[PDB]
Amino acid sequence: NFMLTQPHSVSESPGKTLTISCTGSSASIASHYVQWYSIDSSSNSASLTISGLKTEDEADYYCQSYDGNNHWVFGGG
Amino acid sequence: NFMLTQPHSVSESPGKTLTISCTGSSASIASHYVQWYSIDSSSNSASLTISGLKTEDEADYYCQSYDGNNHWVFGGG
Amino acid sequence: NFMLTQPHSVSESPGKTLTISCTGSSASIASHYVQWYSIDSSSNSASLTISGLKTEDEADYYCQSYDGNNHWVFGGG
Amino acid sequence: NFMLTQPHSVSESPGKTLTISCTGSSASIASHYVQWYSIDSSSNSASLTISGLKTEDEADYYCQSYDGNNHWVFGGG
Amino acid sequence: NFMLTQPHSVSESPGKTLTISCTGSSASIASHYVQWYSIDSSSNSASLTISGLKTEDEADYYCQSYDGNNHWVFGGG
């Protein structure tokens, strides 16, 4: 779901840069998650058959960020 | 869902730059999530058959950001 | 859903720049989420058949941002 | 749904610049979400058949932004 | 789900740079998670058959980040 590219970056940052939390779900079939460094690049999926699928899902994500100065702070349930 | 590209960036930022939280869901079939660094680039999916699908989903996402100075603060349920 | 490109950026910002939260949902079939750095670029999907689909979804997203100075603040349910 | 491009930007901003929250939903079939850095660019979808689809969805999005100075503030349900 | 590339980076950052927590789920079948350093690159999946699938999942993710100076702070359940 999340796609991020920075092919030419000059960056100056006094701070905690990449704070990454609570990503998600991937239910995949013959998927191609592809990354690399007459020309032919080829990622190929053929002719499949799927008959019957049933899924039931309950997803609960919790990310809490409490900063500065905190006192008797309650988070969550 | 989320697509972000910065191919030529000169950036100065005194702060916590990329704070990334609570991304989502990917239910995919023969999907191509593609990234790379006579020419032919090729990502190919063929001729499939799917008969019957049933899905039931409950998704609850929670991201809370409490900053500065906080006192007896309650979050969530 | 969210598409953001900055191919040539000169940016100065004293602040927390990219605060990204609560993205969404992707239910896809043979999808092409494509990013790269006689010419032919080619992303191809062929001739498929889908018979019967049934989906029931309940999505609840919660993002709360409480800043400055806060006291006995209640958020959520 | 959300498309944002800034190909040549000179920007000065003392503030938290991109605060992005509560994006949405993508239910797609053979979709092409395309981004890159005799010429031929080609993204192609062929001749498919879909017989019967039924979907029932309930989406509830909640984004709350409480700033400055707050006291006994209640948000949500 | 999470894809991040930085092919040419010059970065200066006095801070804890990559703080990565609470990633997710991958339920995959014949999937290709591909990374490398007349030309032909080829990742290939053939013509399979799947009859009947049933899955029921409950996922609860918890990431909490409490910083600065904290006193009697309660997190979680």
Numbering used by the authors:
A (entry chain B), B (entry chain C), C (entry chain D), D (entry chain E), E (entry chain A): 1 to 37, 66 to 105
From the paper:
The disease is associated with the presence of a plasma cell clone, and is caused by extracellular deposition of misfolding-prone monoclonal immunoglobulin light chains (LC), transported to target organs through blood. LC subunits (ca. 215 residues) consist of two β-sandwich domains, each hosting a disulfide bridge: the highly variable N-terminal domain (Vl, ca. 105 residues), a short joining region (Jl), and the C-terminal constant domain (Cl). Here we present the cryo-EM structure, at 4.0 Å overall resolution, of ex vivo LC fibrils extracted from the heart of a patient affected by severe AL cardiac amyloidosis. We show that the ex vivo fibrils are composed of an asymmetric protofilament hosting 77 residues from the LC Vl domain, coupled to two low-order regions that comprise about one-third of the Vl domain and portions of the Cl domain.
Cryo-EM 3D reconstruction of AL55 fibrils resulted in a map at overall resolution of 4.0 Å, in which the cross-β structure was clearly resolved. Consistent with the 2D analyses, the AL55 density map showed a fibril core whose consecutive β-strand rungs are related by helical symmetry, with a rise of 4.9 Å, a twist of approximately –1.6°, and two low-order outer regions. For each LC subunit deposited along the fibril axis, the inner structured core is divided into two segments: the central part of the density displays a “snail-shell” trace that is surrounded by a second, “C-shaped”, extended polypeptide stretch. Several bulky side-chains visible in the map, together with the Cys22–Cys91 disulfide bridge, supported chain tracing and modeling for 77 residues of AL55 Vl. As a result, the first N-terminal 37 residues map into the internal snail-shell region, while the outer C-shaped stretch hosts residues 66–105. Individual LC subunits assemble with a parallel β-sheet topology along the fibril elongation axis, i.e. along the inter-subunit H-bonding direction. Each subunit presents nine β-strands; β1–β5 belong to the snail-shell region, and β6–β9 pack around it in the C-shaped stretch. As previously reported for other amyloid fibril structures, the β1–β5 modeled strands do not lay in a planar arrangement within the fibril; rather, the snail-shell region adopts a β-helix-like structure. On the contrary, the C-shaped region (β6–β9) lays essentially in a plane; given that it is covalently bound to the snail-shell region through the Cys22–Cys91 disulfide bond, this segment in subunit i is located at the i+1 level. Two salt bridges stabilize the fibril core: expectedly, Lys82–Glu84 is also present the native folded state, while the Lys16–Asp95 salt bridge links residues that are 40 Å apart in the folded AL55 Vl domain.
